[PDB]
Structures are given as structure tokens and as C-alpha cells.
């Protein structure tokens, strides 16, 4: 009898509301513009699959349409908040050595996990052998940088697609958003933009966890009486 | 438990089909969230084919009416001693001030570009802005 | 009534800068590795400039300097490269310290 009401009133309650966690408050187009999110690489480095998200080139410098970025970021933050609310494992991945410390620190602070080092072969496709069969794979992977240091797509994207793990991702003008479940077109090299992404994701995850705790406490209190 | 055919469909399609087929006893945690709030584009793998022939990328070049004035000003005067403070969103460069004055004078009804340029330069010189010429 | 993205892009100082060639900008030294200074100037990428032989110790983290920009992004297309190859940094000349 406990499950029949617990499952509904906790798990399925946020799924009815469009924005349960009010992630739209966190960011604004003005804020993204101030964080230099719209900047992209030169037209030569452009990846064709990123053409729909490119507003236009400013003197052979692609500008990322922040109108589309706002909607994509809304979807991605809402998805991340819902996954955190369901206590799913969230793994940040970014091989960019500049932000490795910041990303690891943010992941540790928000209670989620980070992998900013050399992604060993089969860390996901061979996780059962590398960790023991009882290991629990991440339920959501967030790429703050979808390219490795040789500018090829991160192998973790393909591996997560193989293991059916949804991927939130910051795709730049030269990135490949084909297999990323929730692409977020935006600048991934500017320190301001990366800091903005880290703040937004940390805030969404923390809000989701706090809301989960509050809802669990309220449901347990009301069920007793 | 699961299909590793990332080149066939999306994770959502594969998971839904496997659940329908009964291979996956229980839906994954993310499945309900994806169903409630799907992304704008289904994450289906696509090969990035190279363009050929008359095909061309539809990316436009960001040009404005003030671009002509900016080019003319930078040709005549170039980069002034006042550097660019791009860290300031409210920054107004010397070229930006010239463009603003040109727009103000154009709103007055004048239409000659090569005369409005000189009039704007005279007005800014009266304002005291340094307008050293390149040569 | 909220400003649209198009308006922000139109009135952005980076847009007003036009071409980045030989433009004068004010950057900040946000990192130092021996005699190499990493300067952010409001662009997408930073720039690495050698510490000047004169007054080199006067450059420290947070020091504001004047730069002559050559290119915001250093990219090149090689033989057989389908896409441009970039070094993820800008090209600028370090004029020297800037004083308010």
C-alpha cells in the first residue's frame, strides 16, 4: 500500500508540471550574452550539424543563436533537475584541462560525480568488468566539453549512446550534436561561459535534491496522519 | 539488457522498443523524464556528409547599416588611442560615438554620406574627441 | 518588454569592434606560467604573450594591459584537412601595462 501512493505522489508529481523546479529563473538571454555564450569558432571550423543553431557569422566568426540556446538550456536544466530529483547518478565529463579543477569541485559540491581525466577505454561499455557486475552506471551524463584534446568527439558520447544513458551537452560551433540527447549550443571555451554552465547545473541539481527532500518529508509526515 | 546499436534510432526509440518486446523488464530511470519533456530533435545518429556543387551552408553574415560608417571611420582614422574595453557591456567606442552622431545627423534629414561624414567629424571635434587621421 | 538577442548582438562592444586586426583592447592577465601571460580581452579565446624584458615583474594576475589584436581565433586549413585547425587562442601584441 505504501508504494501505490509513494511512487505516484513523489516520482510522477513533477512530471505533470512543465517546469516543476522553475529552472527558467536561473538563466536569461541577457545573462547568457554577458557570459559570452553566443561566441563560436571561425566559419572554417564550423560543423555542419551545428548550422541550425548558428544565428550567423560575424566576420568569419559564428555566433550561436541564444534564442535557441535558451530553449535548449531550459530543456537540459529541467531534465537534469528531474534526474537529480529521482536520485539518479549525474556524471560531468570534460577533458578541457583548464576547467578540470572547477568542474570536479562543482561536482563534489553538488553531490554528483566528475570525470575530467583520460577516459579509459570501456569505462562505460565495460563497466561490469572494470567495477564489478553490481556497479550502477550513471543515469545522466553532462558534457561541458564534447571534444577531446585532439578535437575529435569525446568517446564518452558514443559510449553513453551505446549504454542508453541520456547526455546533456554544451555543443560549440565545431562540435557534433548528433548523438547528444540534450544539446545546448553555446561557447565552451570562455571561462565566463563555463562558469555560468557550472553554476546553472549546480543550482538545478541542488534545487532538485532539496525539493526531493522536502517532498519526501511532506509525504512521510502526511501519510502517518 | 539493452541495445548497443547507437547507429540505429535513438536511445529513446531503442529503449521503448525493447520494453515493448519485453527484453527490458523495467524502464530506465530517465525514460519517464524523456517522455514527459523530450528534446527538440530526437538524438538520431547522422553521418556528417560533405557538401558539393551548388550546395552551400545557409549561414548568413551579420551586417548592419552602421557597418559602412564603421568601415569608413576606421579607414580614415583607424584605432584611436582609446582602447576597447570589451569587458564593459556599456562601453561606447570612439567609432561607436561617430556612428551615433552620424545617425543623429541622418535623422535630421541629411543624405549625403561623404558630406555627413565630414559634418559628424566636425561635430565630434567640437565635442573635443581626438580624431587623428591615419595619414 | 525585454531586449531581444538581435539587439544585444547589434549593440555588443565586440560587434562594434568590427574587424579585430590591429585594434586596441584592454585585457587582464588571468594566469601566469613563468614568463608567459594569459590575457583575456573579452573575446572567446585568451592570448599568450611573453613577459616583457622591461618591467616584467610588474605584470601579475589581474594586471590590466593594452593589446593590439591580430586575430580573435588562430585557425588554419592544412593539406587534406576537411575542417580548419585551430590552436584555441588569439593573436595579440602586448603593448604594456595600462594605468587608469
Amino acid at each position: 500500500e505504501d508504494s501505490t501512493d509513494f511512487n505516484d505522489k513523489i516520482l510522477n508529481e513533477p512530471l505533470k508540471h512543465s517546469d516543476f523546479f522553475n529552472v527558467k529563473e536561473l538563466f536569461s538571454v541577457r545573462s547568457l550574452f554577458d557570459a559570452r555564450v553566443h561566441l563560436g569558432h571561425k566559419a572554417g571550423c564550423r560543423h555542419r550539424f551545428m548550422e541550425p543553431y548558428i544565428f550567423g557569422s560575424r566576420l568569419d566568426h559564428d555566433i550561436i543563436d541564444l534564442e535557441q540556446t535558451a530553449t535548449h538550456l531550459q530543456l537540459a536544466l529541467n531534465f537534469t533537475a528531474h534526474m537529480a530529483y529521482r536520485k539518479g547518478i549525474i556524471l560531468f565529463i570534460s577533458r578541457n584541462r583548464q576547467f578540470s579543477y572547477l568542474i570536479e569541485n562543482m561536482a563534489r559540491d553538488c553531490g554528483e560525480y566528475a570525470h575530467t581525466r583520460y577516459f579509459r577505454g570501456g569505462m562505460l561499455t565495460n563497466a561490469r568488468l572494470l567495477f564489478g557486475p553490481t556497479v550502477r552506471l550513471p543515469d545522466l551524463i553532462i558534457f561541458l566539453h564534447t571534444l577531446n584534446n585532439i578535437f575529435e568527439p569525446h568517446v564518452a558520447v558514443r559510449d553513453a549512446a551505446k549504454m542508453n544513458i541520456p547526455t546533456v551537452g554544451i555543443v560549440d560551433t565545431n562540435c557534433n550534436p548528433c548523438l547528444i540527447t540534450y544539446p545546448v549550443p553555446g561557447n565552451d571555451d570562455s571561462p565566463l561561459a563555463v562558469h555560468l554552465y557550472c553554476r546553472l547545473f549546480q543550482t538545478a541539481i541542488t534545487r532538485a535534491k532539496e525539493k526531493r527532500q522536502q517532498v519526501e518529508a511532506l509525504y512521510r509526515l502526511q501519510g502517518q496522519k | 539488457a539493452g541495445s548497443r546499436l547507437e547507429t540505429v534510432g535513438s536511445i529513446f526509440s531503442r529503449t521503448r522498443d525493447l520494453v515493448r518486446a519485453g527484453v527490458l523488464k523495467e524502464k530506465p530511470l530517465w525514460f519517464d523524464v524523456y517522455d514527459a519533456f523530450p528534446p527538440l530533435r530526437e538524438p538520431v545518429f547522422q553521418r556528417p556528409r560533405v557538401r558539393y556543387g551548388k550546395a552551400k551552408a545557409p549561414i548568413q553574415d551579420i551586417w548592419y547599416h552602421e557597418d559602412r560608417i564603421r568601415a569608413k571611420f576606421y579607414s580614415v582614422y583607424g584605432s584611436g588611442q582609446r582602447a576597447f574595453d570589451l569587458f564593459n557591456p556599456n562601453f561606447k567606442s570612439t567609432c561607436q560615438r561617430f556612428v551615433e552622431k552620424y545617425t543623429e545627423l541622418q535623422k535630421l534629414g541629411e543624405t549625403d554620406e561623404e558630406k555627413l561624414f565630414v559634418e559628424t567629424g566636425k561635430a565630434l571635434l567640437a565635442e573635443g574627441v581626438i580624431l587623428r587621421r591615419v595619414g | 518588454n525585454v531586449e531581444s538577442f538581435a539587439s544585444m548582438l547589434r549593440h555588443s562592444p565586440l560587434t562594434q569592434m568590427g574587424p579585430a586586426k590591429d585594434k586596441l583592447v584592454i585585457g587582464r592577465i588571468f594566469h601566469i606560467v613563468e614568463n608567459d601571460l594569459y590575457i583575456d580581452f573579452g573575446g572567446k579565446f585568451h592570448c599568450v604573450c611573453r613577459r616583457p624584458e622591461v618591467d616584467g615583474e610588474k605584470y601579475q594576475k589581474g594586471t590590466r594591459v593594452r593589446l593590439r589584436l591580430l586575430d580573435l581565433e588562430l585557425t588554419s586549413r592544412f593539406l587534406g584537412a576537411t575542417t580548419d585547425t585551430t590552436v584555441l587562442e588569439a593573436n595579440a601584441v602586448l603593448l604594456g601595462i595600462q594605468e587608469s
Binding site: L59 | W63, A71 | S4, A6, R10, P19
Partner: peptide, 26 residues
């Protein structure tokens, strides 16, 4: 639909081609 949208025109900042020293001379 809005004035702030970019307009289509030839690159105004395009610097002229570096003509050879004898170009235009007989």
C-alpha cells in the same frame, strides 16, 4: 520583422586586393 536583424550587403570592411606594383601601368 525587426530593425535589429542583420542586413545583406557586401563586406564593408573588406580591404582592397594588394595589386601588383605594375598593375594599371603599361
Amino acid at each position: 520583422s525587426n530593425e535589429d536583424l542583420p542586413i545583406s550587403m557586401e563586406n564593408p570592411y573588406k580591404e582592397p586586393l594588394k595589386k601588383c606594383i605594375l598593375c594599371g601601368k603599361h
